């Protein structure tokens, strides 16, 4: 009688090594290429040639790339030891769940990113106050808790709307502060690791909303309407909050009303990512074209 | 809208962002830093100049090989798809947490190691014949078993000490044959691989039961010692179980008093890594110079 006799009695099934000669969808071995050929660490990139131009940034550019930064952070803590996990038992096949685990782990040097910023270019205490602000201001927390409770639940499609969400919506009214600021001279180095972090975004947003569809079309005539309405309600809930978010960083800065356009374009890629239309109409979505050329 | 206002109300402190520009306990960032640093993927050795050398290797050597590698390929596909995920809730600190995700991604990247060598290598019979065969040893599926008894249950500290029993132990009835074909001067390109592997398991095992200790610690005397009972059990246990699985890979070939001795050694450096004493005398642990080399 070992204490693991019942465990053992009650799995029969073999479990299973992983075979890479054996691949039942290959789109999951092109995303672990293309991830894994990927790979980078915020070290590569000299943040410290950014030290010029974020002295020269005003007071108020630097307390918003310090909150919108401290946000994203927060934001790849949640993905990296949440979520990517959260996705694991639901996986299709053994290849996707490998992917998985790259995605957590790339979350975290991800997350990592902004302290080598921080720790580059900020003081202690504009660190310190960036992280208080960032566990004190309301639509940060809201965004969080509302995409963690998916991730706590235990519907495996809602957690990858709530992560295609994250990667494809979330993180753009913060991604938008440096491809800004870049196009003017500014953070010139920091930009290149947030073009890597969105290097693997788009892919993490566009693999994810591809397992969503196929799991969804596994399902009744009902339910697939239901899920789509969900997905459609959360969006909404998550631009709304976002909005005020939005309004509250950049709204001394002016540039609010840009950002929202970005909003409402970026709202627009995850839902199709997910395989679902727009939500705005293509003309509520014209970011100015130096924000789309930064990003290139 | 209202789906997640439960969730909310029960999880009213702060969802936290991960600092590191505060460190509480340093050697989270020694590991991080050593891991990553130490990132490598399989295509970057070049496995098909082993050809020559794999082809003149017995059938009986051959198969030996096959079957090493898949038991390891399956222990990899374990610990990280199944094993470092469970260790996530229980971190002491969220930079521990950003290790797992590494350590996991990394566990997926060694058990794909696995199969761009039988790629490279093997007939596409001697691959399925080798997972079936992986599917239906005993041994194999009963340590795999016993392993995943204890991530599934709700003790984190055994799920430490499983995890670095994996690791510093049962991954060695497995290492002994690429390092003793080296040693040959045959697969010296695929040992280059198993060295990649074996740095990164060295610094696993070592963190995880420094992660042990600093837990059990925190009991009574009287709860420390029914630990080390405990660990001491499942030691029995697995080597008994790896004796087994031992002798049916090796008889054949001859070498099984010599990977007894390896294991031996072994599990004296598992149970040393969760800061107890071997189990076996140093004159039962001999191993030869010129494996213990490939070894380091
Ligand atoms: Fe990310
Ligand atoms: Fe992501
Ligand atoms: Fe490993
Ligand atoms: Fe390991």
Request: proline share 4%; charged share 25%; hydrophobic share 35%.
């Amino acid at each position: 009688s070992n204490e693991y006799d019942e465990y053992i009695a009650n799995h029969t099934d073999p479990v299973k090594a992983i075979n890479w000669n054996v691949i039942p969808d290959e789109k999951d071995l092109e995303v672990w290429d293309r991830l894994t050929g990927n790979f980078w660490l915020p070290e590569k990139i000299p943040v410290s040639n950014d030290i010029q131009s974020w002295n020269k940034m005003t007071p108020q550019e630097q307390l918003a790339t310090m909150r919108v930064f401290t946000g994203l952070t927060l934001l790849d803590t949640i993905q990296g030891t949440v979520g990517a996990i959260s996705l694991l038992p639901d996986a299709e096949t053994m290849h996707e769940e490998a992917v998985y685990t790259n995605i957590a782990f790339m979350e975290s040097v991800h997350a990592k990113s902004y302290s080598n910023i921080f720790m580059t270019l900020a003081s202690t205490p504009q660190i310190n106050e960036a992280f208080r602000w960032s566990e004190e201001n309301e639509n940060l927390q809201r965004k969080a808790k509302i995409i963690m409770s998916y991730y706590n639940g235990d519907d495996p499609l809602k957690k990858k709307v709530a992560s295609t969400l994250l990667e494809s919506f979330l993180f753009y009214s913060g991604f938008y502060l440096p491809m800004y600021l870049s196009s003017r001279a500014k953070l010139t180095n920091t930009a290149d690791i947030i073009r890597l972090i969105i290097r693997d975004e788009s892919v993490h947003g566009y693999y994810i909303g591809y397992k969503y569809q196929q799991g969804v079309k596994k399902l009744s005539e009902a339910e697939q309407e239901e899920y789509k309405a969900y997905t459609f309600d959360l969006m909404y809930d998550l631009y709304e909050n976002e909005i005020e978010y939005t309004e509250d960083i950049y709204d001394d800065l002016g540039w609010t009303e840009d950002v929202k356009r970005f909003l409402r374009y970026n709202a627009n890629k995850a839902l199709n990512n997910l395989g679902y239309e727009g939500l705005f109409p293509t003309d509520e979505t014209k970011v100015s074209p130096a924000i789309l050329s930064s990003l290139s």
